[PDB]
A paper describes a structure:
Human transthyretin (TTR), a homotetrameric 127-residue protein, is the main carrier of thyroxine (T4) in celebrospinal fluid (CSF) and the second main carrier in blood. TTR also interacts with other proteins, such as retinol-binding protein (RBP) and thus contributes to retinol transport. Interestingly, TTR also interacts with amyloid-β (Aβ) and plays a protective role in Alzheimer’s disease (AD) by sequestering Aβ and reducing proteopathic stress. We also present the crystal structures of Fe2+, Mn2+ and of Cu2+ bound to TTR crystallized in the presence and absence of Aβ(1–28).
When TTR crystals of the P21212 crystal form are soaked in FeCl2 at acidic pH, only the B monomer in the asymmetric unit changes its conformation, whereby the E-F helix and the stretch of residues 85–92 undergo a rearrangement that is accompanied by a variation in the dimer-dimer interface. Human TTR crystals are particularly sensitive to FeCl2 soaking experiments. The TTR-Fe structure with the strongest anomalous signal in the phased anomalous difference Fourier map, out of 35 successful soak experiments, is reported here. The largest anomalous features for the TTR-Fe complex are located in proximity of Glu-51. On A monomers, the electron density can be fitted by a three-atom Fe-cluster and on B monomers by two Fe atoms. An additional Fe site at the entrance of the T4 binding site involves Glu-54 from symmetry related B and B′ monomers belonging to the same tetramer. In total, sixteen Fe atoms (including the clusters in interaction with Glu-51) are bound to each tetramer chelated by just three residues from each monomer. The conformation of the TTR-Fe complex, with an Asp-38–Asp-38 separation of 25.7 Å is intermediate compared to the two TTR-Re complexes. The large shift in the stretch of residues 72–92 of B relative to A with a Thr-123A–Gly-83B distance of 27.0 Å and a large Leu-110–Leu110 asymmetry attests to the largest conformational changes observed in TTR structures to date.
Residue numbers in the entry:
A (entry chain B), B (entry chain A), C (entry chain A), D (entry chain B): 10 to 125
Write the structure that this text describes.
Amino acid sequence: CPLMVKVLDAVRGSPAINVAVHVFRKAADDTWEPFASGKTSESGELHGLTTEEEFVEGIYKVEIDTKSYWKALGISPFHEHAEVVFTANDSGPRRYTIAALLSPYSYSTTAVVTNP
Amino acid sequence: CPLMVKVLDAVRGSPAINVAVHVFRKAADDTWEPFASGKTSESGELHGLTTEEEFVEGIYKVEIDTKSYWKALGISPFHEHAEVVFTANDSGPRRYTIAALLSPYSYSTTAVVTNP
Amino acid sequence: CPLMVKVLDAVRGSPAINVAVHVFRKAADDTWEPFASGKTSESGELHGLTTEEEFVEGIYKVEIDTKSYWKALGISPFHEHAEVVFTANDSGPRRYTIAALLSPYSYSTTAVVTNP
Amino acid sequence: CPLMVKVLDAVRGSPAINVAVHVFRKAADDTWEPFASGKTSESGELHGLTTEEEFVEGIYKVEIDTKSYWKALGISPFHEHAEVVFTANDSGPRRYTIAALLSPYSYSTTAVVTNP
Ligand SMILES: [Fe+3]
Ligand SMILES: [Fe+3]
Ligand SMILES: [Fe+3]
Ligand SMILES: [Fe+3]
Ligand SMILES: [Fe+3]
Ligand SMILES: [Fe+3]
Ligand SMILES: [Fe+3]
Ligand SMILES: [Fe+3]
Ligand SMILES: [Fe+3]
Ligand SMILES: [Fe+3]
């Protein structure tokens, strides 16, 4: 798994379950081609999005939708989408972990990049 | 002044200075319309984006252009932007402060609501 | 005012109000001596902790008492405190701002240095 | 592993390797008994600190020292210790993950608590 996504809730200190994640790649004619997608697990993690063979250098957009998570808590969320855009594998192949930390009025996001 | 944006640099222990900030507002056809923009001062604050009477109820998006910020300091950062999305309610006159904390690989955004 | 401490609540989207803050200074026998303390105002700011002439070069520690803060709001938080440790250099007159962002299970501290 | 510790560098976006970690437990006569200790790995993680049989309810202090990490980067760090104090296993057994995010002027720390 070269690309992991974690989502956490800063209020509850728990993993965010069933967050929808959509990954896009910037395509040749200046548009976003679909690339991968999934839901986060009990542990709030999602990998198995791609393989090193499909995860070529390029520009990727990672979108999350947290509607299912707040719904199951009985929370009527105010906002529920977040996104990052980064450039991948420019120095050849790396593993990316992208973590998001949720509060109703605060959003934090961190990227860890490691060598496979 | 009803809308403040404050931005800090976690690497250098200082306000982020001259960072461009674009504020959009969500329009009747669910698109984003430009609302305001500016650059951060030496103390990292940007205000004078809008008057009380022009900052109506709605959904607003603040894009802080951090890629150019880090690149100017000779750092290839991970993110393109820092963003946050928030809702202004039609309530009384209220101060909205958007605070941003920046690293090359991590950032956090927070919307703070007060009365002056 | 050379030492400011600002504290925000990420859950409630507001300044943290009435939070106790204790500042210690590292003494000649490598122990911590009380330096200053106070409570945060309605805008979450605490200043008037020290004068320019009494805030000498050294190593200082800010303990923000967040357990009691969250418990007062009926939340059993994870941390006891938020802390940060920083060094004042003997340089010119400089403004030190300690900013704190608080959730029940996550918190961040930042020391910002400016000139007034 | 009921107790994991991660340490990350927000400047480099990399795991912090060889961070020394010392865990203490609050003992009956109001003092800190040693409990567990270790160094973080290539991936910045440390588990194998304890077992569910030794990780009883109580008050634990987790200390890190990041001297070896900065040394190997050729960095003369200003500060290099951090600590959290929390109460464990009060609602019976839980798994704790404690993550710390480093910048020279900013420190963030998050706790994720999950059900084994
Ligand atoms: Fe499972
Ligand atoms: Fe299960
Ligand atoms: Fe995992
Ligand atoms: Fe101000
Ligand atoms: Fe909001
Ligand atoms: Fe002020
Ligand atoms: Fe410092
Ligand atoms: Fe290894
Ligand atoms: Fe290895
Ligand atoms: Fe692991």
